[PDB]
């Protein structure tokens, strides 16, 4: 196998990590384990501390671009690498023991646990004025040497590593989406009824969506056109429950539903990123440094008490709207999830 190694700029501090992406199976997140190597003669009264932090960030404020750079912590953890604390909890694992065998006794294991309520890695799309980077929530591992946790960092004896928390498609299929709404007129029984449904609840990235709409226009009003869209809802709960909604895919069909007639059709729509590059604030998956990534997967949570998550929650829905003539309109919304299949 292979492991990831990053060292401090002075070269005297090095942290070893097994994986870069840690998944959560809706009940247990992958533990973050690894070892840190330090020159024994470099530190005599110093101590090695490793901290895991997940925080809202509008651009890294440890780089070289000028302007504003926000940072709001969401969870912080600490660990004393050297000298070692009592071994429990979490005695060294197979990866940790193999690394300690590989580099001898000058490496020291460090262990972390990601709580369930923590959000996943979501990056918002930068706009033209958001030079450099944009808002997003990301995970970080920092190994530094100091006399105390409150001691200011030299920035030349510390190493920062970026990791991701990701989710995959649940193997159990959900209920088939379906929603119908009947528009009624007070004059008489001339109700206009439409029914919209999908073929499944979970869709992969790039997989087309097949939505069937049946319209029974029993009124004298005529339907000018029918449009089907997919919209992404992003919930930001840093201080107050804000929300960003943005259409990621649209299809327009000038289909006339004549009065006292029935209509039925199947529409195919596929959300992708090639046509949503300019939409500022569009939720994207967690990036390591700058590589291209797809639309953010839906942040699914299994029932529970629905604990307050203070990150970014992204959902997807399909909007079907009929614009009837001379006033009025009827619309249908049916939600669906969108995430990657579990790797083999």
């Amino acid at each position: 196998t292979r492991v990831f190694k990053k060292s401090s700029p002075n070269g005297k501090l090095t942290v070893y990590l097994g994986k870069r992406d840690f998944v959560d199976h809706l009940d247990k997140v992958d533990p973050v384990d690894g070892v840190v190597l330090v020159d024994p003669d470099y530190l005599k009264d110093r101590k090695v501390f490793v901290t895991l932090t997940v925080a809202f960030r509008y651009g890294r404020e440890d780089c070289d671009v000028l302007g504003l750079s926000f940072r709001k912590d969401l969870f912080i953890a600490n660990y004393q690498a050297f000298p070692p604390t009592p071994n429990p909890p979490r005695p060294p694992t197979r990866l940790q023991e193999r690394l300690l065998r590989k580099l001898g006794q000058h490496a020291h294991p460090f262990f972390f646990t990601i709580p369930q309520n923590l959000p996943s890695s979501v990056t918002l799309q930068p706009g033209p004025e958001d030079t450099g980077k944009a808002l997003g929530v990301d995970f970080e591992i920092r190994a530094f040497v100091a006399k105390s946790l409150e001691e200011k960092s030299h920035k030349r004896n510390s190493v920062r590593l970026v990791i991701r928390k990701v989710q995959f498609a649940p193997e159990k299929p959900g209920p088939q989406p379906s929603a119908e709404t009947t528009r009624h007129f007070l004059m008489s029984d001339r109700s206009l009824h439409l029914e919209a449904s999908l073929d499944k609840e979970l869709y992969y990235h790039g997989e087309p969506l097949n939505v069937n709409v049946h319209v029974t226009n029993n009124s004298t009003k005529t339907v000018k056109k029918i449009k089907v869209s997919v919209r992404q809802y992003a919930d930001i709960v840093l201080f107050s429950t804000a929300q960003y909604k943005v259409p990621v895919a649209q299809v327009e069909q000038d289909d006339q539903v004549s009065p006292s007639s029935t209509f039925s059709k199947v529409y195919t729509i596929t959300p992708f990123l090639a046509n949503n590059r300019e939409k500022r604030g569009l939720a994207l998956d967690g990036k390591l440094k700058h590589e291209d990534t797809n639309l953010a997967s839906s942040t699914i949570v299994k029932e529970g008490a629905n604990k307050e998550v203070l990150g970014i929650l992204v959902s997807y829905r399909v909007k079907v709207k009929l614009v009837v003539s001379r006033g009025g309109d009827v619309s249908v919304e049916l939600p669906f999830v969108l995430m990657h299949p579990k790797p083999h």
Partner: antibody, heavy 118, light 105 residues
Framework: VQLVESGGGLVQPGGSLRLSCAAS????????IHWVRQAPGKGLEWVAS????????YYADSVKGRFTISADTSKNTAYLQMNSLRAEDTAVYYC?????????????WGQGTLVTVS | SDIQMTQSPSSLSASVGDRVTITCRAS????VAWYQQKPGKAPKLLIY???SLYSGVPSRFSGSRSGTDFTLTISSLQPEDFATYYC?????????FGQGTKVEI
């Protein structure tokens, strides 16, 4: 799942020829389309690629500018527009498919169409 | 600046059921795939990520990584296993193929 190439034959040097790779059984947004040519005797050689999800097209430096790859997402079909054909462009052309997300090799290939320049 | 992939030998011969191994050395560290091409037909993928077996291919084929060197091994040569084998990397654009290894009967 299948891939079929079309548009073979012979073209005089300096001419042009467009090849159409008709795809079936997979979506054009969940997969990436690549073109690999194999000269008679000489092994394989990658020339061009397209990613419909992101909207990126890549070309080998030996074909940059001359060759253009495009895909029509309506019918799940890709095209390779070759221009300024030269004598070293003769090869059997295979259109190949790979997963758009987390590329794992060219799993699916076409039957290949022979292209000659003389 | 492109990655140069070289595989050896250019050709080899084994009667039947022998142990045949093919090595492939990357000029720069790379994300390696192996393809088998029958004469007159299109290649078909055998191993991706330099170790992961493709679905449906026999288990006799195997691959391993040792630094910047990649090895394709066949435990026993089937009577239909004569072909030219290619070594590919896809860590960087453009992707580069090997020169081939004509495994004769």
């Amino acid at each position: 799942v299948q891939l079929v190439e079309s548009g073979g034959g012979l073209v005089q040097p300096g001419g042009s020829l467009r090849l159409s790779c008709a795809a079936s059984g997979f979506n054009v947004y969940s997969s990436s389309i690549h073109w690999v040519r194999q000269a008679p005797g000489k092994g394989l050689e990658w020339v061009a690629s397209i990613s419909s999800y992101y909207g990126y097209t890549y070309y080998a430096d030996s074909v940059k500018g001359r060759f253009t790859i495009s895909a029509d997402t309506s019918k799940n079909t890709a095209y390779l527009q070759m221009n300024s054909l030269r004598a070293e462009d003769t090869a059997v052309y295979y259109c190949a498919r790979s997963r758009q997300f987390w590329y794992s090799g060219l799993d699916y290939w076409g039957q290949g169409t022979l292209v000659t320049v003389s | 600046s492109d990655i140069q992939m070289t595989q050896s030998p250019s050709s080899l011969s084994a009667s039947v059921g022998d142990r045949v191994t093919i090595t492939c050395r990357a000029s720069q560290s790379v994300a390696v795939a192996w393809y088998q091409q029958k004469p007159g037909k299109a290649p078909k993928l055998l191993i991706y990520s330099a170790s992961s077996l493709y679905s449906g291919v026999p288990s006799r084929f195997s691959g391993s990584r040792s630094g910047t060197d990649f090895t394709l091994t066949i435990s026993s040569l089937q009577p239909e296993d004569f072909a030219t084998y290619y070594c590919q990397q896809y860590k960087y654009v453009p992707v580069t193929f090997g020169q081939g290894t004509k495994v004769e009967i």
